[PDB]
Amino acid sequence: SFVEMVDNLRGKSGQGYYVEMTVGSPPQTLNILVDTGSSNFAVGAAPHPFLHRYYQRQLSSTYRDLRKGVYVPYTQGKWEGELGTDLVSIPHGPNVTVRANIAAITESDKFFINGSNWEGILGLAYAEIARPDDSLEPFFDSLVKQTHVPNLFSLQLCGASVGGSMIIGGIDHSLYTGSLWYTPIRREWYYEVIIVRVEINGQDLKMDCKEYNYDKSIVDSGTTNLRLPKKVFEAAVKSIKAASSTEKFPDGFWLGEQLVCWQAGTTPWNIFPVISLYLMGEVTNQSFRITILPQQYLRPVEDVATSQDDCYKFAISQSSTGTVMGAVIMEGFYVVFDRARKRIGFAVSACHVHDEFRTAAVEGPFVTLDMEDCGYN
């Protein structure tokens, strides 16, 4: 019955993927951002300039007040609100209803996005990073406890405004080609993984593999960019600059501020390298790689000028909190969050990114010695 969940995600480019949900009795419909990088289910519950609708607890006969406050600070945005429970359903999801913890957002700062069309957030990661603490059961944990939905979900994020699928409770084989390759979930808090090797246009960055995971590496559908630790970011930018040196860019482009443009259809994709991330595999001394095309890390942005050219933002950012495999990495892959077996699977998506001579890929097996040494402690 997974066909009912195909294409159940929508979004505007750079503004997050959201799924339709209902909360309360009678059901109140809200669009909910899909976020594997946090663990709180929270919804707008008060008027806001950027909200077209919000959760009205007074109108729901099944609402229960938990008489506890809550706040969540993300990288830049944050909200605070009031904890409660209510009945929750996903119209284009499994035919179930769960009583879930809900943070009713009453104030926020740089959290809601003008025009994003979503009014709440579904944190899909584990309780360990839930606020105020890990006793607040996350939505997916509630779903799995109260129903027969299997303990896994899969995300097919399709690029560009944008669409995709969140398959709740399983894997839909019509959404990917080739084989699924699995990497262990290192620890159940974020969806933490271990990167064991990085290549750019086939050239190994040749860093201590601990640098790739300093201080963690995670899969985060709620963050747009590939975000890399300082040392890795500098090595990668230097290599990407060298490969594209025939053209000149503002250096604020490499910081993610200035967008670069070319005459519509003349974008020189061939001068930007492919990036291969090798992930720890399921068996001893075995890894696999995913290969990222420049069409993933050069994100298209609407040109502010009257010219209708092709303009792009550099979607690789420097991080001080580890590697983030964000939505632009996930796009074009089918990503299986197999919580029951503590693993994350990658396969080439049915909605894959199209280069002329190159293709995004998930390939294995590879042999990599001492993979355990790549995790940071």
Ligand SMILES: COCc1cc2cc(c1)C(=O)N[C@H]([C@H](O)CNC1(c3cccc(C(C)C)c3)CC1)Cc1cccc(c1)OCCCCN2
């Ligand atoms: C370059 O960095 C800026 C940046 C860009 C983006 C998202 C975040 C940060 C963002 O903050 N993302 C968090 C995720 O939950 C973030 N997940 C992380 C995180 C970071 C800090 C604290 C927490 C805890 C709440 C678990 C989690 C692990 C990385 C979820 C989120 C919150 C608010 C608005 C969002 C997304 O909009 C989605 C569209 C924009 C996506 N790009």
